[PDB]
Design a protein around this ligand. Structure first.
Ligand SMILES: Nc1ncnc2c1ncn2[C@@H]1O[C@H](COP(=O)(O)OP(=O)(O)O)[C@@H](O)[C@H]1O
Ligand SMILES: [Mg+2]
Lengths: 370, 156, 156
């Protein structure tokens, strides 16, 4: 009788029960398969590991992400991820709880349709729903007006909402997020002689990026400071005890969000994308969109990203405007918190896609109910 | 009038929230704001039943449509405040005026929806007084403390 | 639940083994550790039949694959402990915390495999309860003492 809320990100699964204030399962959205020779009898029967199971044993596994850029690419590994989520992590029976799922905007329709079908036919959920992650972030922030900049492992998206009305023509999606920054950091770590190639070493580099990287308020003076001194250099100890030092890779990696040309993309930075999304909205709502810049997702968790974000948008916007960037401390789970707010809402209970409706109208019911 | 006194005591709470926003009021920091959000949401749910009853005693194609619209807004806002206050409580317990801003914005939204619901309820009760059911509510356009609207300035 | 009580009493044994590792527990030296290894291996074989039955009452392309994986791990760990305990009994009889380390490591491995087998068995029984055969086992997801998972910390 209590709904489930599974936030399937590209990087992490955030799962829990509607009504709660925090997910109960947060594990990597990876499936690992052994890549070496099993030489002991019975030690190689398990052919696949999911979640923290795979990060624990990643030294003998090949780690694969079922989701790239917010689109599910492996539907047998994602199916394993969902089975893990329901049975090993949450330990529920899916056919008694309605499940709320999340999806990025401007995403293929087959993604949503196959999620609907997998739920209703492999997990027999009584009902389900697919919600847009930026609307859920705005739910969690306690607002009904504001432009949400949500950055995850796979996608960065801007959804402007005013008085509960979205402006879908001003939604901007950008396939540049945490995994692209991890790849860029692996690339520019080679300048110091550090070679991380394996998927496990990619997880190591993701850890380095989360612990050491930050966003420079002014990039050029930070490059000058790093060149002049060694005050910005920090060390990091690898899983086998080697120590690496990185000086300007710390703020060069997150700068790819504001200069996507670092990784060869032609698009505009997240500040320019946010401004361009605000200026596709009606002139009468732009003032309230400027003052409510909700940032959610884990790629917005760099130290200094809100200050740089506000500085850049202030440069772009008129000088009489009211630029505020809203970055809650818990914004790494804003999508899940908003999903649990919505799934527990009393007025939402007629908005589930029941299995009767699915049986009438096939998986295509999800484009018209959601 | 139950509706008026409930909305107006919630207005007292929402005043104390703005006074914390100005930095000088009866609330010291975020914890008092979380508690105030919880009680304003509870009083909003009470307001929700009051609106439900006034709507249920009203004809279909009447002012009940606007009233139900505002009641659904009230439901969304009260629920958001309770989860957001619980989230802020957990965040404080683990680790913030910026944090208080989300709760205060939700409270402003709720109070605006409650004012809209109050006037909608008054119109519904006055317009359909001696329709049956409304008499049992006993809301005779006088229990509502409606001032006369003040005149416009002829020259601006 | 037979599975839960068997695994948890083995956990009591494995706690006593770690307590000897810390140097302060109910075991004086290697001989007590050898005896404890023998009984934990015996209880592991009992656990092995319990897993065998739960697997045999399960559909093929189901959670029985993981369960059989963990059961094969259990069988190797129990076998290693029984031969290794016999080896070190002979070594002591002929001639050692360092010696205790191999048995304690095998016991840690066995206990980890048993925890994995416990959760796999629970998933297999819950997921396929009113499939025939599982009802005869009478393991209705309540005999399993599964706590609700605790919430994550929002801020770290
Ligand atoms: N403290 C941090 N600093 C910078 N990046 C982070 C931090 N924590 C997580 N990330 C990045 O955020 C991504 C996960 O964020 P999340 O919002 O969970 O993504 P998704 O919605 O795709 O699951 C990961 O790629 C990780 O690299
Ligand atoms: Mg996300």
């Amino acid at each position: 009788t209590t709904a489930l809320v599974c936030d399937n990100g590209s990087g992490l699964v955030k799962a829990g029960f509607a009504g709660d204030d925090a997910p109960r399962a947060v594990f990597p959205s990876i499936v690992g398969r052994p890549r070496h020779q099993g030489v002991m009898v019975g030690m190689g029967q398990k052919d696949s590991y999911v979640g923290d199971e795979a990060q624990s044993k990643r030294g003998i596994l090949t780690l694969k992400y079922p989701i790239e850029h917010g689109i599910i690419t492996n539907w047998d590994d994602m199916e394993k991820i969902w089975h893990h989520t329901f049975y090993n992590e949450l330990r529920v029976a899916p056919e008694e709880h309605p499940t709320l799922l999340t999806e990025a905007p401007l995403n293929p329709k087959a993604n949503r349709e196959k999620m609907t079908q997998i739920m209703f036919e492999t997990f027999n959920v009584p009902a389900m729903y697919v919600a847009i992650q930026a609307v859920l972030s705005l739910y969690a922030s306690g607002r009904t007006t504001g432009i949400v900049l949500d950055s995850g492992d796979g996608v960065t998206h801007n959804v402007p909402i005013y008085e509960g009305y979205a402006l879908p023509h001003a939604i901007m999606r950008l396939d540049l997020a945490g995994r692209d920054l991890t790849d860029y950091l692996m690339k520019i770590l080679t300048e110091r002689g550090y070679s991380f190639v394996t998927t496990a070493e990619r997880e190591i580099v993701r850890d380095i990026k989360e612990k050491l990287c930050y966003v420079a308020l002014d990039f050029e003076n930070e490059m000058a400071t790093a060149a002049s001194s060694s005050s910005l250099e920090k060390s990091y100890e690898l899983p086998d005890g080697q120590v690496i030092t990185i000086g300007n890779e710390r703020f060069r990696c997150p700068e790819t969000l504001f200069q996507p040309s670092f990784i060869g993309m032609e698009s505009a930075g997240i500040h320019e994308t946010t401004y361009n999304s605000i200026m596709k909205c009606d002139i009468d709502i732009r003032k309230d969109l400027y003052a409510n810049n909700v940032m959610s997702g884990g790629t917005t968790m760099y130290p200094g990203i809100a200050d740089r974000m506000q500085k850049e948008i202030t440069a772009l916007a008129p000088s009489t405007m009211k630029i505020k960037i809203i970055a809650p401390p818990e914004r790494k789970y804003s999508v899940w918190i908003g999903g649990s707010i919505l799934a527990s809402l009393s007025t939402f209970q007629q908005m589930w896609i029941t299995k009767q409706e699915y049986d009438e109208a096939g998986p295509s019911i999800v484009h018209r109910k959601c | 009038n139950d509706i008026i006194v409930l909305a107006k005591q919630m207005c007292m709470i929402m005043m104390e929230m703005t006074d914390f926003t100005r930095g000088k009021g009866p609330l010291k920091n975020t914890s008092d704001v979380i508690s105030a959000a919880k009680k304003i949401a509870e009083a909003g749910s009470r307001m929700d039943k009051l609106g439900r009853t006034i709507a249920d005693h009203c004809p279909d194609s009447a002012c009940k449509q606007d009233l139900l619209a505002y009641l659904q807004r009230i439901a969304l806002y009260c629920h958001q405040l309770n989860i957001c206050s619980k989230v802020k409580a957990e965040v404080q317990n683990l680790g913030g005026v910026d944090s208080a801003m989300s709760l205060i914005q939700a409270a402003k939204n709720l109070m605006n929806a409650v004012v809209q619901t109050v006037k909608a309820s008054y119109v519904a009760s006055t317009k359909y007084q001696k329709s049956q059911g409304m008499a049992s509510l006993n809301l005779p356009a006088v229990s509502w403390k409606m001032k006369a609207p003040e005149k416009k300035p002829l020259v601006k």
